Amino acid sequence: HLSDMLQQLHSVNASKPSERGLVRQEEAEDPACIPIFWVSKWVDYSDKYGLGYQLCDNSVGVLFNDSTRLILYNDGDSLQYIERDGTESYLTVSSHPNSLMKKITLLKYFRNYMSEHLLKAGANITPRERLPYLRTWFRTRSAIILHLSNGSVQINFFQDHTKLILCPLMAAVTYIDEKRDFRTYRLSLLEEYGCCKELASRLRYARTMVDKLLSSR
Amino acid sequence: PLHST
């Protein structure tokens, strides 16, 4: 997925979408390519426990410091656990091995915090119709980069609150601007019709972030 | 930031 994403991003960036003729960005919009999932909220407690996040469907996940994962489905009880070796187990909050008591308790804390505080990213978006989990993430001075198991890469910029949701399957990018307005574009159509320098710059940055993901797999 | 908006 990452290699495909890199090729898609390289292709759009090489077309110099903001540096040519009349920009027809609107013609690159494709609402059918809207993502099914993205990260609506996140909490970095990696100093001790890990990275907690909420997906737009109100499900929650934690990527713990020991590289294990716990995912709570939006029914508020069903759980999936993923061990280091990749083994996937299914359980509930009420019915679980005693060995998972601490991790389940931690997820509860993350969940409650993200239910009580913080804004839902993409709240105004209608998602497209087995949950993806957080494969890996990292932060830079300017952004947090979240790589989902379905191939999607989300980049949230800290300073201006703008966001990209990249999907290599749709070969598309969803851009959320400073006003929380959103558009989904087909990357090949951005090559065809161009885009503003703001989106173009963020796509150049996205390529460098994908390079980091690929070189640190 | 240690958490989202």
GROMACS .gro file of C-alpha atoms in nm, chain A residues 42 44 118-119 139, chain B:
model
   10
   42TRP     CA    1  -0.610   1.101   1.935
   44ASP     CA    2  -0.042   1.067   2.283
  118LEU     CA    3  -1.184   1.700   2.207
  119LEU     CA    4  -1.356   1.770   1.877
  139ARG     CA    5   0.524   1.300   1.500
  218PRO     CA    6   0.052   1.888   2.124
  219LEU     CA    7  -0.009   1.562   2.320
  220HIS     CA    8  -0.373   1.528   2.202
  221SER     CA    9  -0.590   1.632   1.910
  222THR     CA   10  -0.799   1.950   1.894
   0.00000   0.00000   0.00000
